[PDB]
Write an enzyme that holds these catalytic residues in place. Structure first.
Site, PDB file in Angstrom:
ATOM      1  CD  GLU A 118      -2.831   0.609   2.811  1.00  0.00           C
ATOM      2  OE1 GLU A 118      -2.835   0.487   3.848  1.00  0.00           O
ATOM      3  OE2 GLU A 118      -3.902   0.705   2.052  1.00  0.00           O
ATOM      4  NE  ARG A 156      16.740   7.486 -26.218  1.00  0.00           N
ATOM      5  CZ  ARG A 156      15.727   8.158 -25.925  1.00  0.00           C
ATOM      6  NH1 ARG A 156      15.045   8.043 -25.243  1.00  0.00           N
ATOM      7  NH2 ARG A 156      16.021   9.278 -26.632  1.00  0.00           N
ATOM      8  CG  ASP A 162      17.389  12.639 -30.885  1.00  0.00           C
ATOM      9  OD1 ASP A 162      18.314  11.387 -30.912  1.00  0.00           O
ATOM     10  OD2 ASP A 162      17.684  13.043 -31.299  1.00  0.00           O
TER      11      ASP A 162
HETATM   12  N1  SFG Z   1       2.406   5.561 -11.482  1.00  0.00           N
HETATM   13  C1  SFG Z   1       2.660   5.148 -10.483  1.00  0.00           C
HETATM   14  N2  SFG Z   1       4.231   5.496 -10.737  1.00  0.00           N
HETATM   15  C2  SFG Z   1       5.168   5.198  -9.860  1.00  0.00           C
HETATM   16  N3  SFG Z   1       5.306   4.650  -9.155  1.00  0.00           N
HETATM   17  C3  SFG Z   1       3.820   3.616  -8.835  1.00  0.00           C
HETATM   18  C4  SFG Z   1       3.056   4.163  -9.584  1.00  0.00           C
HETATM   19  N4  SFG Z   1       1.832   3.231  -9.355  1.00  0.00           N
HETATM   20  C5  SFG Z   1       2.543   3.251  -8.306  1.00  0.00           C
HETATM   21  N5  SFG Z   1       4.142   2.591  -8.032  1.00  0.00           N
HETATM   22  C6  SFG Z   1       4.648   2.495  -7.126  1.00  0.00           C
HETATM   23  O1  SFG Z   1       4.135   0.336  -6.567  1.00  0.00           O
HETATM   24  C7  SFG Z   1       3.540   1.230  -5.489  1.00  0.00           C
HETATM   25  C8  SFG Z   1       2.794   0.137  -3.992  1.00  0.00           C
HETATM   26  C9  SFG Z   1       1.644   1.206  -4.935  1.00  0.00           C
HETATM   27  N6  SFG Z   1       0.815  -0.097  -4.450  1.00  0.00           N
HETATM   28  C10 SFG Z   1       1.078   2.019  -3.273  1.00  0.00           C
HETATM   29  C11 SFG Z   1       0.386   3.061  -4.117  1.00  0.00           C
HETATM   30  C12 SFG Z   1       0.499   4.292  -3.285  1.00  0.00           C
HETATM   31  N7  SFG Z   1      -0.749   3.205  -2.096  1.00  0.00           N
HETATM   32  C13 SFG Z   1      -0.717   5.655  -3.534  1.00  0.00           C
HETATM   33  O2  SFG Z   1      -1.513   4.874  -4.787  1.00  0.00           O
HETATM   34  O3  SFG Z   1      -0.050   6.107  -3.796  1.00  0.00           O
HETATM   35  C14 SFG Z   1       3.907   2.536  -4.773  1.00  0.00           C
HETATM   36  O4  SFG Z   1       4.740   2.738  -3.654  1.00  0.00           O
HETATM   37  C15 SFG Z   1       4.956   3.415  -5.518  1.00  0.00           C
HETATM   38  O5  SFG Z   1       6.144   2.732  -5.053  1.00  0.00           O
END
Ligand code: SFG
Ligand code: SFG
EC number: 2.1.1.228
Lengths: 239, 249
Positions: A118, A156, A162
């Site tokens: 989470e 990159r 590009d």
């Molecule tokens: N769109 C995103 N961009 C970057 N990291 C992400 C993204 N979605 C999920 N993550 C990663 O997935 C991990 C586990 C997620 N289920 C946590 C989501 C968090 N509860 C939220 O909604 O902000 C997060 O701590 C992020 O590190």
RNA sequence: UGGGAGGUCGUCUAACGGUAGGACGGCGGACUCUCGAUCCGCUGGUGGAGGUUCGAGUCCUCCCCUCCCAG
């Protein structure tokens, strides 16, 4: 010069996906890019190597445990020395685009924190994270793919390795055979005149940007040539 | 039981272990909730040099993927997948992925994902073999493997039984179209910051409203555009209004 | 601080005038997990005085605190 990336992740082996394959893999073998990992699990002090914990207020799901993650970050931050920026991958962070990639590219050292479950404790975000970055408006099970995405994109820009270059989508590409499934290659690409080809390709990039992602055209100052070619393409599209 | 099949065309199939041997997605695979099969164009190259890139007409930057090996891999995968399989090309020129797009893509029982390398693929293969083009974001990567894994992961969170018992209460951003609220766990006081008392109150109704308010406030402050066309309850309007007042003035 | 209504673990919800339970929370433990899964203990309550009664969370009086209705 080379790039150094520190990563905090419970699944460091996932990073082999970029370090042992393709352009980035080649980058690693030539020491043009180094990716060091720290696993919060290596920092637990209990029989079951616990790296998660329950969120207060109840409800389902788990958060990453504060102590192991914190210790891993401090250890990585240490190894990184002075000037290393700590980035947390999160859907609530700044959405990555080519400008963000170039900015991130300026940095000589970065540490990337990959969440799981989470997420992470909010107080760690306030006290240890410098910047939060999202790769897009969607939710993943973890931050490892986002971290690798960021790494690949910035990689990159490392010397010796590009589309979006000028704010435009890339033009269409063709290779052998001259005819494929009744489809022929545009004659201009075989004409051999570098100038006619350059102009054709630029016109195509402009047309595609306008048609698929027209909004990417507000922040740009088109040159006389680009304005003229775009004008031509719009005239061709609906006459 | 619930199952999903994803066919992948990639020069580096081993990269996919990143999503099949680890975490939630790894367990989904280990439980047959998610299946990923990979065909490698190099195994379809006639070239004695197992060569998979060809030169672009017009000269220019890099190389393009060779048509024959890629085409043969796509046809073999498409043939194996049988009927009703949607073919997707990962590309920065495609539709930008977001949570709505993830639910829509998640509507498919079978998908084939084509991962480019080098400067990309022949446009004609896109016209003749590809159904839809999707981008994971406005930035350029060295290959489509990470984007494909991203797509797979994103849809995998929506397959029933993947997260466990009653994932309906599992909170993540965009799940209900709003950003997630902040979360806290042990210890109670770290680096001088205390956990908001309501979360320790055991008072259930107040916690529900707090969580909802935080989600609204955070969405409003960070990504207000999401709020542009959102169906909201009377309570969300009230809670949001309270939050907007609270930060302003 | 006018007229009505009402008080039970932190919260929600039970108990004929007869030994105050359950769920969630919080603390801690097992699964032997990568389990965002599931189990298991421990913690903890009748707002306060009187009175009726063999006995009161329950009924009577007063006090206090709380909600609703116009300050
Ligand atoms: N769109 C995103 N961009 C970057 N990291 C992400 C993204 N979605 C999920 N993550 C990663 O997935 C991990 C586990 C997620 N289920 C946590 C989501 C968090 N509860 C939220 O909604 O902000 C997060 O701590 C992020 O590190
Ligand atoms: N943002 C992105 N979203 C989806 N796929 C991407 C993205 N960036 C790169 N790729 C894929 O990975 C490879 C990127 C490079 N080959 C360069 C692609 C080239 N710029 C093009 O216009 O297609 C191609 O297969 C792209 O389809």
């Amino acid at each position: 010069s080379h790039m150094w990336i520190g990563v905090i992740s419970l699944f460091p082996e996932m990073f082999k996906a970029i370090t042992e394959f393709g352009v980035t893999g080649r980058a690693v073998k030539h020491n043009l890019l180094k990716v060091e990992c720290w696993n919060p699990r290596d920092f637990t002090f209990d029989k079951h190597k616990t790296v998660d914990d329950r969120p207060y207020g109840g409800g389902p799901g788990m958060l990453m445990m504060v102590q192991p993650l914190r210790d891993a970050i401090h250890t990585a931050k240490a190894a990184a020395g002075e000037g290393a920026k700590v980035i947390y991958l999160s859907p609530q962070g700044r959405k990555l685009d080519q400008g963000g990639v170039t900015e991130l590219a300026q940095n000589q050292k970065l540490i990337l924190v990959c969440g799981r479950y989470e997420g992470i404790d909010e107080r760690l975000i306030q006290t240890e994270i410098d910047e939060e970055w999202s790769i897009g408006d969607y939710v993943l099970t973890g931050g490892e793919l986002p971290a690798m995405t960021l790494i690949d994109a910035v990689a990159r820009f490392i010397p010796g390795v590009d589309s979006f270059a000028d704010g435009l989508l890339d033009c269409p590409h063709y290779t052998r055979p001259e005819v494929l499934e009744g489809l022929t290659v545009p004659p201009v690409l075989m004409s051999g005149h570098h100038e006619e080809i350059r102009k054709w390709r630029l016109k195509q990039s402009l047309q595609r940007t306008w048609l698929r992602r027209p909004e990417l055209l507000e922040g740009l100052a088109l040159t006389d040539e680009q304005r003229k070619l775009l004008k031509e393409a719009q005239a061709e599209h609906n006459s």
